[PDB]
Protein backbone atom coordinates (compact mmCIF):
# COMPACT_ATOMS: atom_id res chain seq x y z
CA UNK A 1 0.00 0.00 0.00
CA UNK A 2 1.07 3.60 -0.75
CA UNK A 3 1.33 6.11 2.10
CA UNK A 4 1.44 9.87 1.49
CA UNK A 5 4.78 11.69 1.43
CA UNK A 6 5.89 13.98 4.28
CA UNK A 7 3.86 17.22 4.33
CA UNK A 8 6.87 19.34 5.36
CA UNK A 9 9.95 20.31 3.32
CA UNK A 10 13.34 18.60 3.81
CA UNK A 11 14.98 21.59 5.53
CA UNK A 12 12.17 21.96 8.12
CA UNK A 13 12.07 18.19 8.66
CA UNK A 14 15.81 18.20 9.46
CA UNK A 15 15.54 21.18 11.82
CA UNK A 16 12.54 19.76 13.68
CA UNK A 17 14.25 16.40 14.09
CA UNK A 18 17.37 18.11 15.39
CA UNK A 19 15.15 19.99 17.86
CA UNK A 20 13.61 16.75 19.14
CA UNK A 21 17.13 15.46 19.75
CA UNK A 22 18.16 18.73 21.48
CA UNK A 23 15.23 18.48 23.92
CA UNK A 24 16.09 14.82 24.66
CA UNK A 25 19.68 15.91 25.29
CA UNK A 26 18.47 18.71 27.61
CA UNK A 27 16.34 16.26 29.53
CA UNK A 28 19.39 14.12 30.23
CA UNK A 29 21.55 17.13 31.19
CA UNK A 30 19.01 18.41 33.72
CA UNK A 31 18.54 14.90 35.19
CA UNK A 32 22.31 14.84 35.73
CA UNK A 33 22.37 18.36 37.24
CA UNK A 34 19.44 17.29 39.47
CA UNK A 35 21.30 14.22 40.69
CA UNK A 36 24.30 16.40 41.59
CA UNK A 37 22.10 18.68 43.70
CA UNK A 38 20.36 15.75 45.45
CA UNK A 39 23.73 14.14 46.29
CA UNK A 40 25.06 17.44 47.66
CA UNK A 41 22.20 18.19 50.11
CA UNK A 42 20.45 20.56 47.70
CA UNK A 43 17.09 18.82 47.25
CA UNK A 44 15.31 22.08 46.38
CA UNK A 45 17.44 22.63 43.30
CA UNK A 46 17.32 18.83 42.84
CA UNK A 47 13.52 18.88 42.59
CA UNK A 48 13.38 21.98 40.40
CA UNK A 49 15.86 20.56 37.86
CA UNK A 50 14.18 17.14 37.88
CA UNK A 51 10.80 18.69 37.13
CA UNK A 52 12.45 20.82 34.45
CA UNK A 53 14.07 17.73 32.87
CA UNK A 54 10.60 16.18 32.71
CA UNK A 55 9.18 19.30 31.05
CA UNK A 56 11.88 19.20 28.31
CA UNK A 57 10.76 15.64 27.53
CA UNK A 58 7.17 16.90 27.30
CA UNK A 59 8.44 19.35 24.63
CA UNK A 60 10.13 16.59 22.67
CA UNK A 61 6.87 14.58 22.67
CA UNK A 62 4.89 17.57 21.39
CA UNK A 63 7.38 17.98 18.54
CA UNK A 64 7.16 14.23 17.76
CA UNK A 65 3.34 14.40 17.67
CA UNK A 66 3.56 17.18 15.03
CA UNK A 67 6.06 15.15 12.98
CA UNK A 68 3.88 12.00 13.21
CA UNK A 69 0.80 14.02 12.13
CA UNK A 70 2.66 15.36 9.11
CA UNK A 71 3.88 11.89 7.97
CA UNK A 72 7.49 12.83 8.73
CA UNK A 73 9.86 10.10 9.95
CA UNK A 74 11.26 10.88 13.39
CA UNK A 75 15.04 10.41 13.35
CA UNK A 76 16.33 9.82 16.88
CA UNK A 77 20.11 10.03 17.16
CA UNK A 78 22.47 8.71 19.82
CA UNK A 79 21.95 10.79 22.93
CA UNK A 80 25.33 11.74 24.42
CA UNK A 81 26.34 11.16 28.03
CA UNK A 82 25.53 14.34 30.03
CA UNK A 83 28.08 16.32 32.02
CA UNK A 84 28.02 14.85 35.54
CA UNK A 85 30.77 16.72 37.43
CA UNK A 86 29.97 20.25 38.62
CA UNK A 87 31.62 22.75 40.97
CA UNK A 88 28.57 24.05 42.83
CA UNK A 89 25.02 25.41 42.67
CA UNK A 90 26.11 28.68 41.01
CA UNK A 91 28.08 26.91 38.23
CA UNK A 92 25.13 24.61 37.55
CA UNK A 93 22.70 27.52 37.05
CA UNK A 94 25.28 29.50 35.04
CA UNK A 95 25.61 26.43 32.77
CA UNK A 96 21.82 25.86 32.73
CA UNK A 97 21.13 29.49 31.80
CA UNK A 98 23.70 29.40 29.00
CA UNK A 99 22.04 26.17 27.88
CA UNK A 100 18.55 27.71 27.75
CA UNK A 101 19.92 30.67 25.73
CA UNK A 102 21.21 28.17 23.15
CA UNK A 103 17.83 26.41 23.05
CA UNK A 104 16.07 29.76 22.58
CA UNK A 105 18.48 30.57 19.73
CA UNK A 106 17.91 27.25 17.95
CA UNK A 107 14.12 27.83 18.15
CA UNK A 108 14.49 31.28 16.57
CA UNK A 109 16.45 29.64 13.71
CA UNK A 110 13.62 27.16 12.97
CA UNK A 111 10.98 29.89 13.12
CA UNK A 112 13.15 32.08 10.87
CA UNK A 113 13.54 29.24 8.37
CA UNK A 114 9.77 28.64 8.42
CA UNK A 115 9.26 32.28 7.38
CA UNK A 116 11.90 32.13 4.61
CA UNK A 117 10.38 28.95 3.15
CA UNK A 118 6.80 30.25 3.68
CA UNK A 119 5.94 27.27 5.90
CA UNK A 120 3.33 29.07 7.95
CA UNK A 121 1.67 25.96 9.37
CA UNK A 122 5.02 25.16 11.08
CA UNK A 123 5.44 28.86 12.04
CA UNK A 124 2.02 28.74 13.74
CA UNK A 125 2.61 25.38 15.46
CA UNK A 126 5.88 26.64 16.96
CA UNK A 127 4.35 29.64 18.78
CA UNK A 128 3.47 27.73 21.99
CA UNK A 129 7.10 26.54 21.99
CA UNK A 130 8.60 30.02 21.54
CA UNK A 131 6.40 31.25 24.40
CA UNK A 132 7.16 28.42 26.87
CA UNK A 133 10.88 28.49 26.08
CA UNK A 134 11.07 32.23 26.67
CA UNK A 135 9.37 31.76 30.07
CA UNK A 136 11.93 29.01 30.89
CA UNK A 137 14.89 31.18 29.85
CA UNK A 138 13.60 34.06 32.05
CA UNK A 139 13.11 31.69 35.00
CA UNK A 140 16.73 30.45 34.86
CA UNK A 141 17.91 34.03 34.54
CA UNK A 142 15.84 34.86 37.66
CA UNK A 143 17.18 31.94 39.72
CA UNK A 144 20.80 32.64 38.70
CA UNK A 145 20.30 36.31 39.71
CA UNK A 146 18.89 35.21 43.10
CA UNK A 147 21.67 32.68 43.74
CA UNK A 148 24.25 35.43 43.05
CA UNK A 149 22.36 37.91 45.29
CA UNK A 150 22.20 35.47 48.21
CA UNK A 151 25.80 34.25 47.96
CA UNK A 152 27.14 31.19 49.74
CA UNK A 153 28.56 32.54 52.99
CA UNK A 154 27.32 31.02 56.26
CA UNK A 155 23.90 29.55 55.37
CA UNK A 156 23.48 31.22 51.96
CA UNK A 157 23.40 27.89 50.10
CA UNK A 158 20.54 26.73 52.33
CA UNK A 159 18.56 29.93 51.65
CA UNK A 160 19.18 29.72 47.89
CA UNK A 161 18.14 26.04 47.92
CA UNK A 162 14.90 26.81 49.78
CA UNK A 163 14.11 29.61 47.34
CA UNK A 164 14.42 27.18 44.42
CA UNK A 165 12.34 24.63 46.39
CA UNK A 166 9.54 27.20 46.67
CA UNK A 167 9.64 27.86 42.92
CA UNK A 168 9.48 24.12 42.10
CA UNK A 169 6.51 23.52 44.42
CA UNK A 170 4.63 26.58 43.15
CA UNK A 171 4.92 25.39 39.53
CA UNK A 172 3.63 21.83 40.20
CA UNK A 173 0.42 23.53 41.34
- Please give the Cα distance from 41 to 154 (Å, whole number): 15
Rounded Cα distance, 8 and 23, in Å: 20
Enumerate the known binding-site residues for Fe cation: 23, 56, 59, 100, 133
Decide whether 10 or 56 has the Cβ nearer to Fe ion: 56
Q: By C-beta, is 42 or 133 nearer to Fe ion?
A: 133
Please give the residues from 55 up to 114 whose contact with Fe ion meets the rule CB under 5 A.
59, 103
Contacting residue, 136, 147, 163, 164, with Fe ion by CB under 5 A: 136
Q: Which is nearer to a copy of itself, 15 or 97 (CB)?
A: 97
Between the CA of residue 162 and those of 10, 136, 157, what are the distances in Å?
47, 19, 9
Name the residue number minimizing CB distance to Fe ion.
Answer: 136
Q: What is the C-alpha separation between 32 and 25, in angstroms, rounded?
A: 11
CB of 167 to a copy of itself, least distance (A): 12
* Residue 30 touches which member of Fe ion, a copy of itself, none, C-beta under 5-8 Å by kind: none
Q: Which does 59 bind (CB under 5 to 8 A by kind): Fe ion, a copy of itself, none?
A: Fe ion
Q: How far is CA 110 from CA 14, 128, 171, in A?
A: 10, 14, 28
**CA-to-CA distance for 25 and 78, rounded, in angstroms?**
9
Amino acid sequence: HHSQDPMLSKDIIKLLNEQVNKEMNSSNLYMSMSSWCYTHSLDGAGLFLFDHAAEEYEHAKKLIIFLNENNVPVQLTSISAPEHKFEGLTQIFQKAYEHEQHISESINNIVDHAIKSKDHATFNFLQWYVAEQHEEEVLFKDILDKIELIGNENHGLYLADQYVKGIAKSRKS
